[PDB]
Amino acid sequence: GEVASVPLTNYLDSQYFGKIYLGTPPQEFTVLFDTGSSDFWVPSIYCKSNACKNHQRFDPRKSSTFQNLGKPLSIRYGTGSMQGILGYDTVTVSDIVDVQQTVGLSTQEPGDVFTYAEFDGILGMAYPSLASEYSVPVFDNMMNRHLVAQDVFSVYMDRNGQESMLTLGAIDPSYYTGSLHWVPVTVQKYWQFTVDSVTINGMVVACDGGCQAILDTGTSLLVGPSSDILNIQEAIGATQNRYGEFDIDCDGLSSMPTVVFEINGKMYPLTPSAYTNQDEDFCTSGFQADSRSRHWILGDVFIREYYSVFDRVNNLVGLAKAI
Numbered sequence: 001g002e003v004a005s006v007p008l009t010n011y012l013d014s015q016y017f018g019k020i021y022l023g024t025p026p027q028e029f030t031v032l033f034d035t036g037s038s039d040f041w042v043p044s045i046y047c048k049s050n051a052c053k054n055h056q057r058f059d060p061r062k063s064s065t066f067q068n069l070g071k072p073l074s075i076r077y078g079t080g081s082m083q084g085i086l087g088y089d090t091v092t093v094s095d096i097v098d099v100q101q102t103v104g105l106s107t108q109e110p111g112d113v114f115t116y117a118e119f120d121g122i123l124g125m126a127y128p129s130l131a132s133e134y135s136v137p138v139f140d141n142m143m144n145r146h147l148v149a150q151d152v153f154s155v156y157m158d159r160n161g162q163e164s165m166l167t168l169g170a171i172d173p174s175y176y177t178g179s180l181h182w183v184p185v186t187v188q189k190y191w192q193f194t195v196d197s198v199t200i201n202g203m204v205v206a207c208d209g210g211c212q213a214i215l216d217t218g219t220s221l222l223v224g225p226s227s228d229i230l231n232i233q234e235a236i237g238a239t240q241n242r243y244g245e246f247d248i249d250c251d252g253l254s255s256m257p258t259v260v261f262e263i264n265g266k267m268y269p270l271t272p273s274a275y276t277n278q279d280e281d282f283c284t285s286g287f288q289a290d291s292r293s294r295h296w297i298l299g300d301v302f303i304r305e306y307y308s309v310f311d312r313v314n315n316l317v318g319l320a321k322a323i
Helices: 138-144 228-234 250-255 301-303
Strands: 004-007 010-011 015-023 029-032 040-043 068-079 080-093 097-108 121-124 154-155 165-170 178-183 192-195 197-200 203-206 211-215 222-224 259-265 266-270 276-279 284-285 287-289 294-296 308-313 314-320
Touching: 004 015, 010 250, 029 040, 040 080, 068 097, 068 250, 178 192, 178 308, 197 228, 203 228, 222 228, 228 259, 228 287, 250 284, 284 301, 294 301, 301 308, 301 314
Parallel strands: 029 121, 040 097, 211 294, 222 287
Antiparallel strands: 004 165, 010 015, 015 029, 015 080, 040 121, 068 080, 080 097, 154 165, 154 308, 178 314, 192 211, 197 203, 197 259, 222 294, 259 266, 276 284, 308 314
16 A cells, blocks of 8 residues: 655646546546546547647557446536546556556537636546446545555645645645544535534524535535525625626735634634635635535635545544644
8 A cells, every 4th residue: 555645736726636647658637636526537539629629638549558448428517517438547646556447538528617627637536426337436446456555535735835735545744733623424425524504703604503515626616505605705795796706805804704614513714814815916705606506515715724634444524724
């Protein structure tokens, strides 16, 4: 068993992606390491979509270890989707070599979700129940073959810097202070757990009486039901603008309240600096409402403040204060 330190590139505090190598000889790809999914796929030469045209495309004909599976694959990510075929090939993640790994080769990527993204493909980190038929998640192969020292991985996202890190097989203590607090996963599909309440100035403004949340490295913002998120926006002083997002007075942070998420009895505060995104001298709320949200999505906004540990041994989520 080994441990892989995969550096993550940070693009505008909204996309964290690493690099992997597929096939023999290696073909390099940037993948989004996504805890909100469990499928591994890259673009292939057979895909003629625009997203495939402006990204790196895998050429199985040039891979001596590729083995076609002849099985279809279809996934839905955000407003977009992907269709393709499954195959077998070796994937290198840092210093871990995962031979005979199922990988999706895309044939169509309609829409623009993947067209303008910075990563080529997606490597899912959630549970096998969320993976597609005839596919095995990369981390599940790593666990079953004992390629990792511990059946655990860890995510640190650096605010504005280039020091983000995904650790496969261990927990890097350099990225947190204090003690790790463990939260039981409630449904082994996503990294789902219970949130007890959301508090601003001591009053419950969201998640009143309990709500479900998934810890998702594939989501940039902090997504929740529309009414709760609107309550939060009202309480923090954010204002709806005609461009879709919620404005925040950039100079007003020192007066804005802290939003506290209660998870398994512990408090996880988010300061105004934490839940506000700064882009081109414009300040936007990190809270995003979605008419489809049946539960909360704790995205990069939350993970940047809390070093996140995903434990498949005991099926737990560890959280600690990020550096």
